[PDB]
Paper text:
Transcription factors (TFs) recognize specific bases within their DNA-binding motifs, with each base contributing nearly independently to total binding energy. However, the energetic contributions of particular dinucleotides can deviate strongly from the additive approximation, indicating that some TFs can specifically recognize DNA dinucleotides. Here we solved high-resolution (<1 Å) structures of MYF5 and BARHL2 bound to DNAs containing sets of dinucleotides that have different affinities to the proteins. The dinucleotides were recognized either enthalpically, by an extensive water network that connects the adjacent bases to the TF, or entropically, by a hydrophobic patch that maintained interfacial water mobility.
Mutation of the AC sequence led to a much larger loss of affinity than mutation of TT. Mutating the A7 to either G or C of DNAAC resulted in a loss of most water-mediated contacts and a very low affinity. Both DNAGC and DNACC complexes showed only one water molecule in the interface connecting the side-chain oxygens of Thr285 and Asn282 with the N4 of C18 or O6 of G18, respectively. Furthermore, neither complex retained the hydrophobic contacts involving either Thr278 or Thr285, further explaining their very low affinity.
Author numbering: 232 to 291
Write the structure that this text describes.
DNA sequence: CGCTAACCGGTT
DNA sequence: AACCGGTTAGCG
């Protein structure tokens, strides 16, 4: 038992990245706000950020 | 295979 | 609870 892999839209990717470039971490409220803006689950966004930070430490 | 979303166990 | 680091796994 495992969740389907989410397919982010160009719009979702773009806004997630934009948010990352602005803030490296999100407060719970900032997360919920972003999830609501992009029609995503809180956890999808939480996970995105986390994986994005991982990528960020690799590439620096 | 490369990129990356999702999961697990441990850190704090 | 959130993050981290390592791991598994979907898909172009």
């Amino acid at each position: 038992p495992r969740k389907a892999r989410t397919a982010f839209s160009d719009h979702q990717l773009n806004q997630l990245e934009r948010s990352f470039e602005r803030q490296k971490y999100l407060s719970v409220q900032d997360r919920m706000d972003l999830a609501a803006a992009l029609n995503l689950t809180d956890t999808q966004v939480k996970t995105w950020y986390q994986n994005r930070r991982t990528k960020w430490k690799r590439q620096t």
